[PDB]
Design a protein around this nucleic acid. Structure first.
Ligand code: NA
Length: 320
DNA sequence: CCGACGCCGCATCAGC
DNA sequence: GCTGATGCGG
DNA sequence: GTCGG
């Protein structure tokens, strides 16, 4: 892209803030700067030019000046070569190893996947699965495979109980040509906010050998691993989440987990101006002093659009 | 100057 | 044994 | 690190 040197620099800085410095708000600051620069339709000539963008401040402008003048950043060159920092940063690519775990491992001399393989007893269940599928989890999922995955999920859900409703959300629902994982939202008329269901669906997908491993599982959220059946070479293992949501909150949930994140904030902003508060679960009216009323009945995504006097937006048009 | 920056389900640890 | 905190993912 | 009350 037009400013890929800069945006790669900022993303690498973001990762070290999150994984080594444990400074999550600086991680997000660098990511926001990388995003606003990525959308800038000109090749940046100076830090001052970039500082005019929201999310780029004095320090990032200085780094851009150093990068444009010299082609590198001294601080990033240094931490790249740092054995301890580079190893901590790397180990967080294992699902289940966060900044805390990565630091503890490197402190005791465990720095590579091979060290992890030699030290299984030090890994919890999630981390063992993350190590097992390290390469597969970093591959993207082509839309054609997402469609084949959706076929299986919708068929098996309906087989368990034809009154379930299931919706694959995420960027797939907005029409993306590839995905990072699969996000399934599930509800059933017997399950309301006022009124088992998840277990039966997980069990059925395990019985037909679609779900292969479980990272976590409770009464309303499943996180695990699945794999399309092989004809041929085998398909990569993929991350799949399944969320059970009360029926009266289902379409707020589908809206939220379809996104995009940008579209979500724009819709929430607009709802506020019309006197409503929308979150993942509900839409509620706000009184004249800002007191939220009871959740309003929502029986489709369009009900939410109708409340705030927006024309219905198709998922494919929810990029912003 | 200084606090916000999203929040929650699940696994697991720290502590009683 | 239970309760609450933390880590983690997203 | 950046923004803004
Ligand atoms: Na700044």
């Amino acid at each position: 892209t037009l400013n890929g040197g800069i945006t790669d620099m900022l993303t690498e800085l973001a990762n070290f803030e999150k994984n080594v410095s444990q400074a999550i708000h600086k991680y997000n600051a660098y990511r926001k700067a990388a995003s606003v620069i990525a959308k800038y339709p000109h090749k940046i000539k100076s830090g001052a030019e970039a500082k005019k963008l929201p999310g780029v401040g004095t320090k990032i402008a200085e780094k851009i000046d150093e990068f444009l003048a010299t082609g590198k950043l001294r601080k990033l060159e240094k931490i790249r070569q740092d054995d301890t920092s580079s190893s901590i940063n790397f180990l967080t690519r294992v699902s289940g190893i966060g900044p805390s775990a990565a630091r503890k491992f490197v402190d005791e001399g465990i720095k590579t996947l091979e060290d992890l393989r030699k030290n299984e007893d030090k890994l919890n269940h999630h981390q063992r699965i993350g190590l097992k599928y390290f390469g597969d989890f970093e591959k993207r999922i082509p839309r054609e495979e997402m469609l084949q995955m959706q076929d299986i999920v919708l068929n098996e859900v309906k087989k368990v109980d034809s009154e379930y409703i299931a919706t694959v959300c995420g960027s797939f629902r907005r029409g993306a040509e590839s995905s990072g994982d699969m996000d399934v939202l599930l509800t059933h008329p017997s399950f309301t906010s006022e009124s088992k269901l998840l277990h039966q669906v997980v069990e059925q997908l395990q019985k037909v050998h679609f779900i292969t491993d479980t990272l976590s599982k409770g009464e309303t959220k499943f996180m695990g691993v699945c794999q399309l059946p092989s004809k041929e070479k085998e398909y990569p293992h993929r991350r799949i989440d399944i969320r059970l949501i009360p029926k009266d909150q289902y379409y707020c949930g589908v809206l939220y987990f379809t996104g995009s994140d940008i579209f979500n904030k724009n819709m929430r902003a607009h709802a506020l101006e019309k006197g409503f508060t929308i979150n993942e679960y509900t839409i509620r009216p706000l009184g004249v002093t800002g007191v939220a009323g009871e959740p309003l009945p929502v029986d489709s995504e369009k009900d939410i659009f109708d409340y705030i006097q927006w024309k219905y937006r198709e998922p494919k048009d929810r990029s912003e």
